[PDB]
Amino acid sequence: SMAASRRLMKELEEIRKCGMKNFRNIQVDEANLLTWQGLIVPDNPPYDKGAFRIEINFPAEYPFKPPKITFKTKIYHPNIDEKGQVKLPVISAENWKPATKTDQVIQSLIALVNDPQPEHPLRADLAEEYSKDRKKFCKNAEEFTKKYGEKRP
């Protein structure tokens, strides 16, 4: 909770100055340092310029335990749960190095969104759809993502 929270704070500081276009609107509630709020704008058409609000809660053992991520904005995606939970290989406790920076994980999440992976689905129905039929998937995708998610210039 010392070399943990301070590293977390240092990562946050570097993320703030690195105002990368894809991840904007950082909201770190001053009360709890272990929880973050964010807003992500994908460049790709299935989730075109539609900002999705995510929340990142870090464990009290942050340096040695992978953080979990939830989606407060509903999203039509195979690797994303209905509750909003996300299966990111970089996160999963089976293969997570402590040195892995937060921004590298966020960039990995973005890449996961732009190009979904049906190899390991949390939501099987959507995975079978995208693998077999893309155009009808994209229609349902874009329709839903214009229906939920706040656009940002």
Binding site: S1, A3, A4, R7, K10, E61, P63, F64, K97, P98
Partner: protein, 317 residues
């Protein structure tokens, strides 16, 4: 700089023990010329020994890495790191030596290895001993015993004869300003992990990493090594082969590491724990035998599968 003055005991070949206190900056030749009139031996005769090396006559007393109430020996002839039981925080350690046969000190060592060397093995170096009129012989035995080393805590007063501490060979002073993996924070004192990449961590992270992998019984098991920890990066074949490093964590944090390691050993080796409340004694019952007793305990009888009272009929639920 508290006192500066040092007090030291002297134990020679003869049973007499001499208590002499000196200023840290006197010549050893001068010390030789002080010990000699002390017992009545000639100044030219005395050879002083300490931790194995034939002491230089010119070298300064302070130079010898010597604490308080330590022991030196004479005769007529002519950056470490340890964990202390008294001192919870690890302290700078000193290296002393004892004979295998007579379990005593005051002997010359042939090798005198500096650092980063082959060490900590029962059989390594033979040396001449002063005690018992030079009667430490291996010539008769055949089976070879050797001069073995030991460490003492150098932050406090010590009991010269048998005082010892646990050596933490994986802790080094950060000589190249190497950053800790976990916090990217260059710590003066850090730990070096056994993997090829030589990953390093500081003490705070060694504690947080340990106490996080502890509550859930996540220590990796290796039969010879023991229930140790993998590399923070999870590098292969990087298991801490000397467990005593865990003592950086205090009583509760460390003592529970002993308990869990015992419980998990019993479990995997085929043993069963006692289900009567507050017993938990693990009894290694012969694999075929299915009657569970509690040797020197609560004697409640069980079935291996059901965790209930001794039933004759098979436990379906």
């Amino acid at each position: 700089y508290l006192g500066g003055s040092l007090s030291i005991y002297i134990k020679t070949n003869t049973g007499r023990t001499l208590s002499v206190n000196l200023e840290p900056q006197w010549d050893i030749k001068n010390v030789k010329e002080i010990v000699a009139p002390q017992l009545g031996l000639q100044p030219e005769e005395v050879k002083i020994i300490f931790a194995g090396k034939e002491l230089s006559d010119a070298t300064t007393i302070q130079e010898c890495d010597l604490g308080q109430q330590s022991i030196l020996h004479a005769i007529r002839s002519r950056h470490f790191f340890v964990h202390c039981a008294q001192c919870n925080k690890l302290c700078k350690g000193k290296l002393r030596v004892r004979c295998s046969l007579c379990k005593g000190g005051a002997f010359t060592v042939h090798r005198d290895p500096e650092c980063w060397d082959d060490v900590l093995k029962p059989r390594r170096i033979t040396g001449h001993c002063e005690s018992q009129e030079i009667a430490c012989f291996d010539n008769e035995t055949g089976d070879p015993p050797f001069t073995e080393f030991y460490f003492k805590c150098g932050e406090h007063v010590s009991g010269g004869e048998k005082d010892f501490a646990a050596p933490l060979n994986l802790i080094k002073i950060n000589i190249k300003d190497v950053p800790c993996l976990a916090c990217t924070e260059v710590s003066e004192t850090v730990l070096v992990f056994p993997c090829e990449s030589k990953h390093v961590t500081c003490l705070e992270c060694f504690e947080q990493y340990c106490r996080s992998r502890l509550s859930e019984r996540q220590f990796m098991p290796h039969p010879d090594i023991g229930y140790t920890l993998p590399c923070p990066a999870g590098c292969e074949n990087s298991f801490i082969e000397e467990i005593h490093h865990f003592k950086l964590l205090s009583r509760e944090e460390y003592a529970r590491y002993q308990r869990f390691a015992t419980e998990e050993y019993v479990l995997q080796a085929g043993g069963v724990l006692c289900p009567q409340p507050g017993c938990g004694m693990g009894l290694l019952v012969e694999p075929e035998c299915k009657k569970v007793t509690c040797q020197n305990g609560c004697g409640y009888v069980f079935c291996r599968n059901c965790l209930q009272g001794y039933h004759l009929g098979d436990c379906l639920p």
